[PDB]
Design an enzyme around this catalytic site. Structure first.
Site, PDB file in Angstrom:
ATOM      1  N   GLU B  51       0.381  -1.293   0.398  1.00 42.87           N
ATOM      2  CA  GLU B  51       0.083   0.177   0.203  1.00 42.87           C
ATOM      3  C   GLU B  51       1.147   1.489   0.134  1.00 42.87           C
ATOM      4  O   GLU B  51       0.030   1.828  -0.944  1.00 42.87           O
ATOM      5  CB  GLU B  51      -1.094   0.145   1.405  1.00 42.87           C
ATOM      6  CG  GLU B  51      -1.928   0.858   1.257  1.00 42.87           C
ATOM      7  CD  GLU B  51      -1.800   1.866   1.997  1.00 42.87           C
ATOM      8  OE1 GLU B  51      -0.931   2.471   2.499  1.00 42.87           O
ATOM      9  OE2 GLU B  51      -1.783   3.331   1.291  1.00 42.87           O
ATOM     10  N   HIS B  52       2.586   1.546   0.046  1.00 43.88           N
ATOM     11  CA  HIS B  52       2.481   2.769   0.251  1.00 43.88           C
ATOM     12  C   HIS B  52       3.610   2.299  -1.235  1.00 43.88           C
ATOM     13  O   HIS B  52       3.576   3.515  -1.519  1.00 43.88           O
ATOM     14  CB  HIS B  52       4.203   2.239   1.158  1.00 43.88           C
ATOM     15  CG  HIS B  52       3.878   2.734   3.299  1.00 43.88           C
ATOM     16  ND1 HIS B  52       2.805   1.821   3.400  1.00 43.88           N
ATOM     17  CD2 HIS B  52       3.574   3.536   3.995  1.00 43.88           C
ATOM     18  CE1 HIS B  52       2.247   2.748   4.922  1.00 43.88           C
ATOM     19  NE2 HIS B  52       3.053   3.471   4.830  1.00 43.88           N
TER      20      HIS B  52
END
Lengths: 98, 401, 51, 413
Positions: B51-52
């Site tokens: 997600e980063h």
């Protein structure tokens, strides 16, 4: 009825201690809420009148007759504030009832 | 009169759902049935770290040029991860509907994880966690999840332990990406000024490539005593029913009845046939036990004696809150994505209103006695929690003599 | 000294060390920028800062 | 259909839109922000904002709370330096008593002295919760150093004024600023008729124009407060255009060119943000425009050590925009960002009700979202440059907080 109420006011005897009528009310929850809502000057006069009445009862004395509380003069100051406390109290009660 | 949510399905299994409305800006998102529950303790931070990495460039759009594109139309790009779902959503205008969908396609497939970035995002994640401990309520809810779901994949956090964060590599990520990003476990949700046929054609054009392929409530308690903190956060929960069990609605009404501690919040967190139903409060040390006593009485009360009027209050309260239609596009879609992932369909607001109005006081106290009365809770405390009662007193407060 | 005039005890501080009184001289549950402030409060919803 | 705006002969604006929403919202907008106080009644608007649930002449406090929570409705108060807005929302079948409660709260308060004496502790608690973050304190400090009299008044009550705000000050503020010519009643999901008919039961008491507020005067100045936060929150602004002036838009296009916060959940998202970079720091453009005056500038959060040159770098970037160093594609992207932000601000129901409300009080007219789009388009490149030079030249006002050992001053900046 007015004269007989003055005679009963003299027979009750809290005017001889310099008290008002609303000073003689028993401090229930509603009465303490009405006392808490008083302005500062009225509260201070009420506390001084109660302290003076307690001191006079300690020495078993009364005030001189010129210093008594005239029935006509007595002011029902706590009354207005009290009604509200009762009104609010009842409203809340009714809400719960329903 | 609320417009219905129309759902189609591609061959891939990616259900493309949309709910058109007048608003000229839209919230197009991709939900994925992939969270920390699907991780196996060797890749406990893979979803968070992906997600980063998901906005740091793809193969077709290398690096910040990608986010330059989402600056160029003035759109907003957000992503979040829970224990069960992952969401990548864009708020944009209506007329920019195609390119946004194409952007989302890159984010789910053809994504590029740069080794350079991996170290930079590791320092970001590591540092944030190193400072995440600051947020107490997050610490308390993580402690509650750990002590309530001991030994299961539902105990482990979304972020994972620093250990894994440091020890993660492209290939691992690649796996999580290639394993938990399957097309039948994906919903393309759109809310606002979108046409369903145009969105279906765009999903057929791009995103048509996505590959096609229990839990035990351990009633227990975790207490992190640290007396230097000014305030204490305490969460008490019992086992929830799950997503598909309709008495959730009734339990929501019960939460609406509860709504002494500086902060008192009730929660009904739901996962696939499980969940946590309870209350979190943040208080000064010298009040904690009294709060607990207060709180248990309320619950017990509902289970023991609940009137008709308060129920009405909850019904109505929930109704307005449950109201989400035209609350916001971001919310609207979020609801489409979660509804297609969890229920398999979008439950309309009329069905929610019917399930709310069928709830009365008798079935509310029946369901509350089923889920609250004489149950072993999970307790998580953090702060000056010495006056927080131990497990026998809380367990005895879970019933009345 | 000479410069002190009548402002000496103001430009100088003297602890007693060894040789009106002080008149009795909280904690609440706990980035972006530049959007003008608009404070909001509600009967039911808790108040918040929209910085 | 679309909004309807009758202007009543006592000055009250009525705006309605019936979209048959399941939850309908009704708000009332008054020009009674914190700018209308002076040095004798500071913090009165904060206590007025927090005093929305007090026993009103028409309804006792118990009812004004138990009746809104009985139907599950919501009553909230939002306040800026110019405007106050009291908003209720709920199911269409209960908005009659919701309008009863809201119009009683607006028109006929009692302001009992024991109630406000109980409310002053909540005033202190609300101020502490609001100043838990550094942005709020640095914006309040920036307004206090930027203006002299009107817009320098804080949104939150000062520490000495707690315990000193009386019932008479609240009554005087309500009687001098809650008049019909400064009020707009806006309803989404309701019929216009009822709003008109609920504007007669109340909103008829005070027909004056209210006690108008002094004109805000700019002062300049830089205030720095060492607070320890590793991050030196620094805001440097100058005087800018008023809301109405065309220049205003140009300044909105200028902040969306310079950067108005991130659009992703964090780089090369701003000329400012781009201007070298090897550290953790946030830089954005600040714009706050009110009906007589505006503030435009830069806002920086950074490590104390680098606080200096980062601020300098941000300032230098604006100077480049003041020298004409900009591209037309950047201005087009800024216009797209601004118009998308406006449309997403009005896409929600409460934001739509606020917008209509603001427009009402401000210009008495509703400007369709479409109209705006073409006006923002009117702003052109040179216009943006112009606003920049205004900032680059006009006397600056600086609010700083943190470890300010390496934070520069205005004569050095």
């Amino acid at each position: 009825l007015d004269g007989f109420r003055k005679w009963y006011y003299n027979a009750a005897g809290f005017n001889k201690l310099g008290l008002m009528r609303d000073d003689t009310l028993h401090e229930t929850e509603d009465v303490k809420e009405a006392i808490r809502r008083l302005p500062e000057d009225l509260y201070n006069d009420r506390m001084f009148r109660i302290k003076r009445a307690l001191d006079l009862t300690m020495r078993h004395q009364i005030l001189p007759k010129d210093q008594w509380t005239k029935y006509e003069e007595d002011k029902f100051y706590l009354e207005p504030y009290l009604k509200e406390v009762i009104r609010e109290r009842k409203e809340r009660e009714e809400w719960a009832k329903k | 009169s609320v417009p219905e949510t129309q759902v189609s399905i591609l061959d891939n299994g990616l259900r493309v759902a949309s709910e058109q409305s007048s608003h000229a800006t839209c919230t197009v998102g991709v939900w994925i049935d992939a969270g920390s529950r699907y991780e196996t303790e060797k890749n406990n931070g893979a979803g968070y770290f992906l997600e980063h990495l998901a906005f740091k460039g793809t193969k077709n759009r290398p690096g910040n040029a990608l986010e330059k594109e989402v600056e160029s139309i003035g759109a907003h790009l957000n992503a979040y991860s829970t224990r069960e779902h992952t969401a990548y959503l864009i708020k944009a205008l209506s007329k920019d509907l195609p390119k946004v969908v194409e952007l989302l396609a890159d984010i789910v497939q053809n994504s590029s994880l740069e080794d350079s970035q991996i170290e930079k995002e590791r320092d970001v994640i590591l540092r944030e966690m190193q400072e995440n401990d600051a947020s107490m309520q997050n610490v308390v809810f993580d402690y509650l999840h750990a002590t309530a779901f001991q030994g299961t994949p539902l105990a482990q956090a979304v972020e994972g332990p620093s250990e894994n964060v440091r020890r993660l590599s492209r290939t691992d990520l690649t796996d999580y990406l290639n394993r938990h990003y399957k097309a039948p476990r994906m919903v393309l949700a759109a809310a606002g000024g979108v046409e369903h046929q145009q969105l279906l054609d765009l999903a057929q054009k791009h995103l048509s490539s996505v590959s096609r392929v229990p839990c035990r409530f351990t009633g227990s308690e975790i207490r992190h005593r640290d007396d230097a903190l000014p305030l204490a956060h305490v969460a008490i929960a019992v086992e929830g029913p799950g997503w598909a069990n309709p008495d959730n609605v009734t339990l929501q009404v019960a939460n609406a009845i509860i709504g002494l501690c500086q902060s008192f919040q009730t929660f009904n967190i739901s996962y696939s046939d499980t969940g946590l139903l309870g209350a979190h409060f943040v208080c000064d040390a010298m009040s904690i036990d009294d709060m607990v006593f207060f709180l248990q009485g309320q619950w017990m009360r509902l289970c023991t004696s609940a009137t008709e009027s308060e129920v009405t209050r909850g019904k109505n309260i929930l109704r307005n809150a449950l109201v989400s239609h035209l609350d916001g596009t971001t919310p609207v879609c979020e609801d489409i994505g979660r509804s297609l992932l969890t229920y398999g369909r979008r439950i309309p607001l009329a069905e929610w209103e019917s399930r709310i109005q069928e709830v009365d006081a008798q079935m509310l106290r029946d369901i509350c006695s089923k889920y609250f009365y004489d149950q072993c809770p999970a307790v998580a405390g953090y702060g000056p929690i010495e006056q927080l009662p131990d497990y026998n007193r809380i367990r005895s407060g879970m019933f009345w003599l | 000294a000479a410069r002190s005039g009548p402002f000496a005890p103001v430009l100088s501080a003297t602890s007693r060390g060894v040789a009106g009184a002080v008149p009795a001289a909280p904690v609440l549950d706990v980035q972006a920028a530049a959007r003008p402030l608009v404070a909001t409060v509600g009967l039911n919803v808790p108040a918040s800062v929209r910085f | 259909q679309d909004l309807e705006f009758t202007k009543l002969p006592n000055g009250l604006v009525i705006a309605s839109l019936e979209n048959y929403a399941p939850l309908s919202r009704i708000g009332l907008f008054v020009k009674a922000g914190s700018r209308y106080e002076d040095s004798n009644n500071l913090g009165t608007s904060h206590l007025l904002r927090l005093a929305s649930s007090l026993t009103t002449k028409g309804a006792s406090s118990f009812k004004i709370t138990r009746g809104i929570e009985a139907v599950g409705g919501k009553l909230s108060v939002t306040a800026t330096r110019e405007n106050m807005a009291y908003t209720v929302e709920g199911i269409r079948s209960d908005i009659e008593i919701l309008m009863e409660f809201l119009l009683n709260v607006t028109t006929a308060p009692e302001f009992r002295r024991w109630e406000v004496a109980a409310l002053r502790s909540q005033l202190k608690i609300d101020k502490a919760v609001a100043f838990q973050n550094s942005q709020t304190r640095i914006i309040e400090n920036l307004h206090d150093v930027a203006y002299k009299n009107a817009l320098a008044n804080p949104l939150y009550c000062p520490d000495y004024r707690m315990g000193k705000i009386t019932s008479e000050e609240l009554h005087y503020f309500v009687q001098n600023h809650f008049t019909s010519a400064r009020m707009a009643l806006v309803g989404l999901g309701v019929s216009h008729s009822v709003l008109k008919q609920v504007a007669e039961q109340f909103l008829n008491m005070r027909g004056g124009l209210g006690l108008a507020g002094a004109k805000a005067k700019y002062r300049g100045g830089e205030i720095r407060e060492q607070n320890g936060d590793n991050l030196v929150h620094a805001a440097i602004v100058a005087e800018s255009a008023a809301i109405g002036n065309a220049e205003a838009n140009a300044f909105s296009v200028l902040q969306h060119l310079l950067g108005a916060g991130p659009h992703i959940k964090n780089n090369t998202t701003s000329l400012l943000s781009q201007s070298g970079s090897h550290q953790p720091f946030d830089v954005s453009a600040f714009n706050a425009s009110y009906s007589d005056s505006g503030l435009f500038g830069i806002y920086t959060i950074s490590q104390a050590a680098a606080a200096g040159e980062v601020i300098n770098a941000a300032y230098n970037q604006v100077k480049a925009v003041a020298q004409g160093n900009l591209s037309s594609a950047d201005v087009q992207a800024a216009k797209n960002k601004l118009k998308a932000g406006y449309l997403m601000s009005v896409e929600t129901s409460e934001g739509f009700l606020s917008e209509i409300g603001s427009q009402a009080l401000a210009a008495g007219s509703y400007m369709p979202p479409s109209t705006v789009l073409q006006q923002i388009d009117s702003v052109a490149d040179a216009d943006v440059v112009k606003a920049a030079k205004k900032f680059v030249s006009g006397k600056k006002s600086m609010a700083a907080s943190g470890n300010l050992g390496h934070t520069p001053f205005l004569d050095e900046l």
